[PDB]
Amino acid sequence: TLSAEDKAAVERSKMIDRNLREDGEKAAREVKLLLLGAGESGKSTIVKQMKITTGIVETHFTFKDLHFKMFDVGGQRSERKKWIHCFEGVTAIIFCVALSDYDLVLAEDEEMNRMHESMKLFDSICNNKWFTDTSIILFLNKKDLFEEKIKKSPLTICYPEYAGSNTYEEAAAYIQCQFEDLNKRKDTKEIYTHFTCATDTKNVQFVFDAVTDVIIKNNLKDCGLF
Amino acid sequence: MITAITIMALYSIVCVVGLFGNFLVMYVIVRYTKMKTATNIYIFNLALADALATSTLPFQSVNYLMGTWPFGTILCKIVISIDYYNMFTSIFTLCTMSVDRYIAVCHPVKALDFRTPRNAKIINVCNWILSSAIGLPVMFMATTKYRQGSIDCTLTFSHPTWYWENLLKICVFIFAFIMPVLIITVCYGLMILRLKSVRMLSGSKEKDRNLRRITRMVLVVVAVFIVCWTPIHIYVIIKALVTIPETTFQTVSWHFCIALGYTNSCLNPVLYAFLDENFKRCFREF
Amino acid sequence: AQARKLVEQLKMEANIDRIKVSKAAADLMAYCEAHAKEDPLLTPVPASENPFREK
Amino acid sequence: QLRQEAEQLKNQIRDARKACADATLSQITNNIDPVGRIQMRTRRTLRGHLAKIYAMHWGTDSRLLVSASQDGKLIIWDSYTTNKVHAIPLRSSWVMTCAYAPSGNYVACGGLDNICSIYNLKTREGNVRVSRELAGHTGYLSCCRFLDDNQIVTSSGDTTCALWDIETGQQTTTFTGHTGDVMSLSLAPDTRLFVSGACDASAKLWDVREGMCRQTFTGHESDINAICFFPNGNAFATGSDDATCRLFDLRADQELMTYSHDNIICGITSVSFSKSGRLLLAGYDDFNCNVWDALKADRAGVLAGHDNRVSCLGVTDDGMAVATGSWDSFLKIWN
Ligand SMILES: CN(C)C(=O)C(CCN1CCC(O)(c2ccc(Cl)cc2)CC1)(c1ccccc1)c1ccccc1
Numbered sequence: 001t002l003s004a005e006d007k008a009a010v011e012r013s014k015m016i017d018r019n020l021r022e023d024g025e026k027a028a029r030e031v032k033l034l035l036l037g038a039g040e041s042g043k044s045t046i047v048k049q050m051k052i053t054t055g056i057v058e059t060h061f062t063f064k065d066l067h068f069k070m071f072d073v074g075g076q077r078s079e080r081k082k083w084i085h086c087f088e089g090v091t092a093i094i095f096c097v098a099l100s101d102y103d104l105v106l107a108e109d110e111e112m113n114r115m116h117e118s119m120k121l122f123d124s125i126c127n128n129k130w131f132t133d134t135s136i137i138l139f140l141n142k143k144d145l146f147e148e149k150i151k152k153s154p155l156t157i158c159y160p161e162y163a164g165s166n167t168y169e170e171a172a173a174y175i176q177c178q179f180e181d182l183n184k185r186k187d188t189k190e191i192y193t194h195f196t197c198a199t200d201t202k203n204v205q206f207v208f209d210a211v212t213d214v215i216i217k218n219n220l221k222d223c224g225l226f
Numbered sequence: 227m228i229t230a231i232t233i234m235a236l237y238s239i240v241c242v243v244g245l246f247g248n249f250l251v252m253y254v255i256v257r258y259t260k261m262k263t264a265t266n267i268y269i270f271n272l273a274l275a276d277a278l279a280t281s282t283l284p285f286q287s288v289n290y291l292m293g294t295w296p297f298g299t300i301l302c303k304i305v306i307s308i309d310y311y312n313m314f315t316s317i318f319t320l321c322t323m324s325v326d327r328y329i330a331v332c333h334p335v336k337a338l339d340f341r342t343p344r345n346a347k348i349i350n351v352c353n354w355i356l357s358s359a360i361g362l363p364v365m366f367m368a369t370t371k372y373r374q375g376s377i378d379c380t381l382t383f384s385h386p387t388w389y390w391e392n393l394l395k396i397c398v399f400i401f402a403f404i405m406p407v408l409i410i411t412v413c414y415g416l417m418i419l420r421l422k423s424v425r426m427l428s429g430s431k432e433k434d435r436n437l438r439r440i441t442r443m444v445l446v447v448v449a450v451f452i453v454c455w456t457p458i459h460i461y462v463i464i465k466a467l468v469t470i471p472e473t474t475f476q477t478v479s480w481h482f483c484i485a486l487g488y489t490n491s492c493l494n495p496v497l498y499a500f501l502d503e504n505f506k507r508c509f510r511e512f
Numbered sequence: 513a514q515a516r517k518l519v520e521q522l523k524m525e526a527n528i529d530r531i532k533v534s535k536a537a538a539d540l541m542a543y544c545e546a547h548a549k550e551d552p553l554l555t556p557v558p559a560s561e562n563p564f565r566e567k
Numbered sequence: 568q569l570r571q572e573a574e575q576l577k578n579q580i581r582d583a584r585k586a587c588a589d590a591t592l593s594q595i596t597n598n599i600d601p602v603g604r605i606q607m608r609t610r611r612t613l614r615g616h617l618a619k620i621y622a623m624h625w626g627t628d629s630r631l632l633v634s635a636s637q638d639g640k641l642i643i644w645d646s647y648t649t650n651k652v653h654a655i656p657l658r659s660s661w662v663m664t665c666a667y668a669p670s671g672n673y674v675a676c677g678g679l680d681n682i683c684s685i686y687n688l689k690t691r692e693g694n695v696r697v698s699r700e701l702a703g704h705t706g707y708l709s710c711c712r713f714l715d716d717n718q719i720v721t722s723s724g725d726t727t728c729a730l731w732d733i734e735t736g737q738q739t740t741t742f743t744g745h746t747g748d749v750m751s752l753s754l755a756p757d758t759r760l761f762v763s764g765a766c767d768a769s770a771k772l773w774d775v776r777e778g779m780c781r782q783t784f785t786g787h788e789s790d791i792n793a794i795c796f797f798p799n800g801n802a803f804a805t806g807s808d809d810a811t812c813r814l815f816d817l818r819a820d821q822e823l824m825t826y827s828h829d830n831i832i833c834g835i836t837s838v839s840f841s842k843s844g845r846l847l848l849a850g851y852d853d854f855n856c857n858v859w860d861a862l863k864a865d866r867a868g869v870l871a872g873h874d875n876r877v878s879c880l881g882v883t884d885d886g887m888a889v890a891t892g893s894w895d896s897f898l899k900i901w902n
């Protein structure tokens with residue numbers, strides 16, 4: 001009543017269904033990490049420590065039996081709006097900020113004040129309608145650069161309203177403190193900070209802890225508790 | 227006269243609230259939400275075990291409302307079997323929900339690839355199978371006896387009734403009380419420690435309030451299980467040890483201790499479905 | 513430097529023949545009414561020839 | 568200097584368009600019978616995707632379609648009996664477009680990987696193997712439509728469309744002129760012209776042979792997310808984000824119809840026309856699909872039943888199906 005062609009079609013679609021199911025089960029354990037950051041931030045440096053096309057750059061690395069996928073968007077330069085909803089469920093963001101550009105003036109704008117531009121980028125990523133529940137990790141990359149930059153230069157170029165110290169520790173604490181309150185929704189969204197510059201597996205350990213915390217939150221949401 | 231009225235009334239009210247809870251839970255978990263997640267599968271299995279377990283309450287109410295039990299013998303066998311089967315499976319799924327939550331919180335990497343719907347399905351059908359592994363001897367040893375001019379449902383053993391009764395009472399006291407309590411306390415205590423030590427529940431007033439109410443509902447579940455399962459086991463152990471004289475107070479206390487387990491079985495749907503926020507969202511849409 | 517090529521592109525777009533909106537909309541309406549019998553969406557065909565039916 | 572000349576030439580174009588407009592489409596269609604309260608039911612519920620679908624394309628045989636979702640799987644769907652003929656593992660997990668050739672021997676996919684992959688369907692070994700890897704865009708691909716079996720036209724994020732020769736992998740024509748990110752293109756029924764829409768709310772029609780841009784239509788406000796020709800090839804309709812679908816004319820060069828509602832504030836991400844052309848179905852963003860009578864600008868039906876955004880929409884070439892995709896891994900076909 002069905003002959004060989006319908007049996008072949010049924011078996012073909014069954015085999016396609018098993019392949020799709022096993023591929024979706026395999027990729028359900030993957031952790032999505034939307035790496036961000038403007039130019040000369042330190043993204044190329046922090047993708048050099050994970051040793052273990054025109055637009056999107058894909059790198060894969062596993063750590064302690066958990067799989068990470070990294071979606072660098074540095075190639076794409078048209079509109080973040082028209083493909084930022086294409087992620088929609090990334091585990092964590094790996095946003096980077098250079099700390100040495102507190103006093104830097106752009107050579108093409110002459111008034112852009114690069115650190116404030118990073119503030120607008122971080123505020124746009126944090127206060128996005130598509131990214132309102134995901135954790136956002138800060139990798140303030142350049143430590144030694146602004147260390148021997150503030151060894152001689154003041155810190156009131158970026159924040160004239162700030163004068164508590166001129167040394168590394170209080171300046172770094174102040175800029176992280178005023179950077180983490182960019183988050184207008186801290187009730188159910190958490191922002192971490194590592195400060196980078198270890199030449200070790202410390203950045204990997206930091207994103208491992210952040211990812212496991214996000215997975216704990218997801219399991220709480222699945223368990224009908226949180 | 228009045229005491230039989232109150233015993234029948236408490237069995238009837240416990241049975242009707244049990245069927246109402248474990249049927250409204252069924253209706254919601256079938257029509258509004260589905261069994262996609264592992265927790266929904268576990269809640270559905272718990273609803274099955276609790277609904278079929280408390281259905282035997284009218285049988286005991288006509289066992290002691292006014293006298294004899296003319297229902298039959300094979301009916302007695304299947305009633306004893308489904309009671310000792312479904313309460314056992316309800317206890318087992320109550321344990322494996324706790325093990326699932328401890329796995330979810332304390333081991334997130336393993337909880338990614340362990341809390342699949344297929345794994346939950348095979349685990350709880352294995353739980354029903356392991357309950358059946360002791361439910362078949364229950365069906366084998368069930369019988370109907372005619373003594374004192376009345377019909378009653380005893381449980382016949384072999385010729386040494388003392389030894390078989392001792393082993394069965396130890397097996398139902400250890401594998402249904404002291405093993406659920408120990409595993410549930412260890413798992414939930416480790417879960418509460420990991421929930422206190424996490425970043426998302428600390429550093430703010432609202433997050434600490436959420437942690438406190440999560441610990442509060444965990445304590446409510448464990449405390450309800452303890453307060454509704456301790457007195458019946460102590461009652462049966464000390465009535466096995468010493469000769470308790472028969473009196474009205476003994477009858478009332480014995481029926482309270484029997485009804486406490488069914489009170490646990492009827493409080494499980496309101497403590498495991500209405501407490502979860504997914505069913506709260508399901509109720510909020512209507 | 514794109515202002516010049518924008519000007520040439522715009523002036524090439526300007527000098528084209530444009531018919532009246534009434535005639536073109538009448539042509540669109542005529543094409544709609546001339547294929548009304550070939551559209552199963554507007555006029556639902558009976559189930560004897562519908563290719564999507566239950567098993 | 569020259570900017571004033573450009574502005575006055577735009578003013579002259581606008582004045583000529585207003586003088587060329589003497590009757591709107593709605594005024595002369597008041598005497599035609601409406602299609603009433605049209606109702607369609609989901610005959611097939613295609614399932615098997617495990618991510619967010621973004622594009623689907625029908626076939627000329629009106630039986631096989633293709634669907635592209637975010638999991639990197641390209642599923643070839645048989646609509647009649649709900650079967651999966653093929654599954655293509657894409658190297659790129661990010662796709663916003665997928666193409667199905669009129670010959671049916673080639674299926675294309677593309678997206679944020681800046682590469683227009685072309686897959687061979689009718690190989691001798693039976694399996695689906697990639698044939699030619701197109702490259703040359705510096706932005707995200709967003710639309711690809713097969714002109715014929717050897718020529719494909721694509722739009723991308725580098726503000727330029729492109730006509731391609733498949734056997735050489737080169738752009739024979741680059742359609743520069745968009746001051747914004749072009750996202751959707753549709754080809755004419757006679758496969759000699761095509762019109763696209765960009766983020767600058769402009770609808771620029773082109774020529775395949777020589778590449779010149781003929782007309783532009785800037786009636787919209789936010790952007791253009793979708794586009795689809797009329798069956799006669801003398802009109803098209805455009806999606807947007809300002810809750811408006813607008814019909815545009817090739818010969819008169821104006822805006823004809825405004826498919827807008829008072830309570831609708833969401834965007835439009837897909838438009839397609841029926842075989843007759845009187846029915847324009849738009850995949851909105853308020854978790855439903857809409858029916859727009861293309862000659863009356865009124866809502867005649869609703870293709871609800873979607874729990875997420877209706878990203879893609881396609882009406883088959885013989886009027887026997889309306890297959891719409893959505894963000895919740897479902898494709899459904901209406902009749
Ligand atoms: C007392 N203990 C130690 C139990 O473990 C018990 C079993 C008691 N069982 C109940 C039904 C019964 O009354 C009956 C007699 C005749 C008929 Cl026709 C029908 C039913 C005979 C006695 C239990 C404790 C508390 C509440 C309910 C049950 C139990 C719990 C869990 C798993 C297995 C067994």
Ligand SMILES: CC(C)CCC[C@@H](C)[C@H]1CC[C@H]2[C@@H]3CC=C4C[C@@H](O)CC[C@]4(C)[C@H]3CC[C@]12C
Nearest residue numbers: 261267270271274347350351352354355358359
């Ligand atoms: C094997 C013999 C001894 C006893 C059989 C009873 C057990 C194994 C049966 C009875 C009722 C059954 C359940 C009925 C319905 C469902 C819902 C479905 O979505 C998943 C399986 C599940 C949850 C079944 C699992 C198996 C089940 C618990």
Ligand SMILES: CC(C)CCC[C@@H](C)[C@H]1CC[C@H]2[C@@H]3CC=C4C[C@@H](O)CC[C@]4(C)[C@H]3CC[C@]12C
Nearest residue numbers: 452453456457458460461464470471475476479
């Ligand atoms: C968890 C809370 C309720 C504490 C647990 C209390 C337990 C241990 C109590 C509650 C009811 C009690 C019984 C109530 C009545 C009688 C009858 C009497 O002639 C002998 C003692 C005996 C048989 C009691 C034994 C102890 C008992 C089972």
Ligand SMILES: Nc1nc2c(ncn2[C@@H]2O[C@H](COP(=O)(O)OP(O)(O)=S)[C@@H](O)[C@H]2O)c(=O)[nH]1
Nearest residue numbers: 038039040041042043044045141142143144145
């Ligand atoms: N001395 C010193 N150099 C640093 C530090 N952090 C980053 N760099 C340099 O910064 C460039 C990456 O920027 P890049 O252009 O690839 O970014 P991108 O957004 O395009 S990926 C690399 O050459 C780095 O040596 C630091 O602490 N100290």
